[PDB]
Structure formats: C-alpha cells, structure tokens
A paper describes a structure:
Aminoacyl-[name] synthetases (ARSs) catalyze the ligation of each amino acid to the 3’ hydroxyl group of the cognate [name] and thereby establish the genetic code for protein synthesis. ARSs assemble into a multi-synthetase complex (MSC), which is comprised of nine ARSs (arginyl- (RARS1), aspartyl- (DARS1), glutaminyl- (QARS1), glutamyl-proryl- (EPRS1), isoleucyl- (IARS1), leucyl- (LARS1), lysyl- (KARS1), and methionyl-[name] synthetase 1 (MARS1)) and three auxiliary proteins (ARS-interacting multifunctional proteins, AIMP1 (p43), AIMP2 (p38), and AIMP3 (p18)) in vertebrates. IARS1 is one of the least characterized ARSs in the MSC. It is a class 1a ARS and has an UNE-I domain at its C-terminal end that is formed by tandem ~90 residue repeats. The overall structure of GgEARS1 consists of an N-terminal catalytic domain (acceptor end-binding and dinucleotide-binding domains) and C-terminal anticodon-binding domain (proximal β-barrel (Pβ) and distal β-barrel (Dβ) domains).
We also determined the apo GgEARS1 (residues 176–706) structure at 2.5 Å resolution. The helical subdomain (stem-binding domain) connects the catalytic and anticodon-binding domains. The electron density map of both the Pβ and Dβ domains showed significant disorder in the apo GgEARS1 structure, indicating that the regions are highly mobile. However, these regions become ordered upon binding to the IARS1 C-terminal domain, which consists of three repeats of a β-grasp domain. GgEARS1 contains a distinct hairpin loop unique to vertebrate EARS1s in the Pβ domain. This loop is located at the opposite face of the [name]-binding surface of [name] and is oriented perpendicular to the longest axis of GgEARS1. Because the GgEARS1 structure is the first eukaryotic [name] structure, we briefly compared it with those of other related ARSs.
Residue numbers in the entry: 188 to 525, 527 to 544, 547 to 549, 551 to 559, 564 to 565, 567 to 571, 573 to 582, 587 to 599, ...
C-alpha cells in the first residue's frame, strides 16, 4: 500500500459515484480504499455526485447512496456535485475553442465512429475559431441543429490510444437539470469532467480501476492544455467475484422476474444485500485491506471474503440454541425442578451470560446410552411409532443441545434461512449469459424453536446457533405472531 507523494494532512481523495442505483460490492471497495488513505494520512475525503448528465441521475438514489456510504461507516469531510462547477467547466471549454484546441462537429455518430477506428480526421477538425464559436452558441442556445453537434478536443487522431482521438467534451441535452435547471443546454462529458473537477477540488490522488488506464493520457492532456494543477492517478484492481453479476440491467432482470424480493435481497451483491446477509463492515474492510492496491485481474471466490468475516464474528458472537419443530420429540427427565445463568461465549467472558427442568430434543438427535452442554443423562426406554423418550439422571461422569419446555421461559418462534448463488456457474462469460444458469430455487426456510434469550434479538445482531453455525437476525420477534428470522452466514471454504 505505497502511495507516492503522500504527506500527513495533505492527501485529498474522493469517491465519485453517480446517483443512478444502489451501491454494490465493487463500489464498496473503491470507497473503502479511499477511506483507507483519508484515515492513514489524516487527509480529506470528498464525496462527489457525478451529476453531469441531467437524465439518468435522480435525487432519490442520492438518498440511497448516502445511506449506503453511512452503513459502510465512511464519514466524508465534504460533499459536492460536479454541477457545482458547470460555469467553470464551460469557461475552460470556451478557452480551448479560443486557442483552437477544440472544434464543434455535427458528423453523424456511425460515421464519427468509423473515422475514429481508421484514424481519420473529421470534416470539421480544421474549422477556423469563429466558425467553431458560431456552432458553439448554437449548442448553447439548445437549437435543433445544435442538438446534432458535439464539442471535441483537438488531440491526435493518429494515436495508439483511442482515448486521444479527439474525444467529445460537451453534448447537447434539452432536459432541465435537477440543480441548475434550464440555465444550461449543454453538459460536459465525464472525460472532460474528472480532470477539471478533481483539480478545482484539490484532489491529490485520484483512484481508478485498471480498466481505465487509457483515460490518463487524455486527462493529463486536458490538464496541461488548461494549465491547472495535476493530481496523481492511482490504480487498483476491480472486483471479479464468482457467481456474481454487477450490471444494473442484469440485476433488475432478477428483480422483475420475481426471483429476488428487492434490491437488498441477501443474494444480491449490493452493499445492502451483503450486509443483510451477514457481512460485517470490519470483515469487509479487512479483506479490502489485505488487497491494498494489488493490481491483478483475478477471479474471486466469495468464500475468501466470508473467511475474513468468520474471524471477525467468531470471537464475540453469543451462542444461543435452536431446534426444529416438526422433527422434535418430547423428553421426560424427572430429577430437575427449576435456572442456571451460564455464559454466552465459552471463551470470552465479556460477551455476557444467559439464563437457562423436566421436558425437548429433535428427530436427528433421537438416535445419536450414557454428556450435556452447560451441564450426563441415561435414558430409560423409547416408546415407539419415536414420539417419546424418558430417562433418569446423574451429573457424575464423562455434545447435545436441548430446550427445556419450562413454563417460566417459553421458547421463541424461529426461522432458519439459507441462500445460495442465483448464478450457478462461477466464472461465466465467453459470450455466454447468466439468464440460463439460474439457481431457480435459491432459498429455503426451515421452521424452528429457539432459546428464550432470543426474545431480545435486534435486527442486525449476530449470534451463533449451536451445532449449526453463525446467524444474523433478519427481523426480531414481536407478540397472529411474527417469528425471529435468522439468516445463515457463510463461513467460507
Ligand atoms: Hg459527437
Ligand atoms: Hg477512451
């Protein structure tokens, strides 16, 4: 994790998401890495909404994304909007026309694309300055002919880097902007956006994934043409997880086709779904922090992330107990007449202590005789088709959970839930599609019955059922009825 130029109190980084949907696991990495540099260098972290486009971006997701940031426990020092700088950006666009480093172009898109591939020059590239300015005021006044034009930088159509072949800087859009309204009929591209905004806002270290290394040459070009200050660009590897798709489009297919109950479904790779599934922020930051800025294309097994999480939650989760209900058998031990206040984590005493006479067990337990936990039974006989077993007792001697059917503390309606990937093929692609690797049954519910110290579970508490594994309370119990829903936390393999 070596950062060139990084001095204490002088690092300024930014997370620049566009308010067009939910944040996902990939966004969570970019954001957690930025936080890392903010925290380690006592620098500024700027959150900036990319709002250059008046269409796709909606202020409803603005709330969604801020709540997503918060639940990752990321605490930005300043919040901004690209549109805060529309006036400055346009003055730089105009500066460039004036110097002959930009030109306006009405060339139809298909033909523009074909010229770029064959490194050809546009019929407009050599417009004199006043003609460009004429076509520019056309664009600025939102006219029907200007809506067919394009503003382009004058770089190098012979470049090996497609990014240097006269990129578009400004396009014509007649939609009102949410914040600037109808003041502007023309709007900057992202490619003209980052350099100037990162420079005005003082950003020192601009993080990107390796996929966009071609843009750097173009950015430094913009930055040198204007003479503004130049941030470092710092790169890291994007997140390639098996069985996973991130595309907004492909995820909303799962939403419409009703295989997933919403954008925070625990099977979804959104920040919400991952957390609701049992991921902790500490587990995520750790796995992120083991990455640092590794820069390698690598297919990721989710279970590597869930392993870091197991190490987080295991030394702190309290151990309760649950059993089913349609495979349970009554028991009679006649030697105990009422509560033992035993611990809740066998090793760390600081987690707390929980409270636990003559009546249950389960089906699968009813066949595996002379040990109990937090407690050595020797059973009389099994009266048969098993539906009852009675026993005697004695604590002197030598691996079994049980729920006493005491009237004092009755037991809580529980549901254990389990999930697996919606996509059954790990590393899928090679012009294939996911739409036909669907784990068409991806959820199972199993009605159960749990220890009374489950009456008090809050949504988000992480416990450990004994003999089953780690769970997360999806919804609490409340006095029909409403069960305490517990979701199975993958432990990584
Ligand atoms: Hg264009
Ligand atoms: Hg490019």
């Amino acid at each position: 994790v070596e950062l060139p130029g990084a001095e204490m109190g002088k690092v300024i980084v930014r997370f620049p998401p566009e308010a067009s949907g939910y944040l996902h696991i990939g966004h969570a990495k970019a954001a957690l890495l930025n936080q890392h540099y903010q925290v380690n260098f006592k620098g500024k972290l700027i959150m900036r909404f990319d709002d250059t486009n008046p269409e796709k971006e909606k202020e409803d997701f603005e709330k969604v994304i801020l709540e997503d940031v918060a639940m990752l426990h990321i605490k930005p020092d300043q919040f901004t909007y690209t549109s805060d700088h529309f006036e400055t950006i346009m003055k730089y666009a105009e500066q460039l026309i004036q110097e002959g480093k930009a030109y306006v172009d009405d060339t139809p898109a298909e033909q523009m694309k074909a010229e770029r591939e064959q490194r050809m020059e546009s019929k407009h590239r050599n417009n004199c300055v006043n003609k460009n300015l004429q076509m520019w005021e056309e664009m600025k006044k939102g006219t029907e002919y200007g809506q067919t034009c394009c503003l382009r930088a004058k770089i190098d159509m012979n470049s090996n880097n497609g990014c240097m072949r006269d990129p578009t800087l400004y396009r014509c859009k007649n939609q009102p902007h949410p914040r600037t309204g109808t003041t502007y009929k023309v709007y900057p591209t992202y490619d003209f956006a980052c350099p100037i905004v990162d420079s005005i806002e003082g950003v020192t270290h601009a993080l990107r994934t390796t996929e966009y290394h071609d843009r750097d040459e173009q950015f430094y070009w913009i930055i040198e043409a204007l003479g503004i200050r130049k941030p470092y660009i710092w790169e890291y590897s994007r997140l390639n997880l098996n069985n996973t798709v991130l595309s907004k489009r492909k995820l909303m297919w799962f939403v419409n086709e009703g295989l997933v109950d919403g954008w925070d479904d625990p099977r979804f790779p959104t920040v919400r779904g991952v957390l609701r599934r049992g991921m902790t922020v500490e587990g995520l930051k750790q796995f992120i922090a083991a990455q640092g800025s590794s820069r390698s294309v690598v297919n990721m097994e989710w279970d590597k992330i869930w392993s870091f999480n197991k190490k987080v939650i295991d030394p702190v989760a309290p151990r309760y107990t649950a059993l089913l209900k349609d495979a349970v058998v009554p028991v009679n031990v006649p030697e105990a007449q009422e509560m033992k206040e035993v611990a809740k984590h066998p090793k760390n005493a600081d987690v707390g202590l929980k409270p636990v006479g003559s009546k249950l067990i389960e089906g699968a337990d009813a066949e595996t005789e002379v040990t109990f936990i937090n407690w050595n039974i020797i059973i009389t006989k099994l009266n048969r088709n098993i539906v009852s077993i009675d026993t005697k007792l004695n604590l002197d001697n030598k691996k079994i959970t049980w729920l006493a059917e005491t009237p004092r503390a009755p037991l809580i309606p529980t549901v254990c839930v389990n999930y697996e990937h919606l996509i059954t093929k790990p590393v899928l692609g090679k012009d294939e599609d996911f739409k036909q690797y669907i784990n068409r049954n991806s959820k199972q519910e199993e009605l159960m019955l749990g220890d009374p110290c489950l009456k008090d579970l809050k949504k988000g508490d992480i416990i450990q059922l004994q003999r089953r594994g780690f769970f997360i309370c999806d919804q609490p119990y409340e006095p029909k009825e409403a069960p305490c829903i517990l979701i199975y936390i993958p432990d990584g393999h």
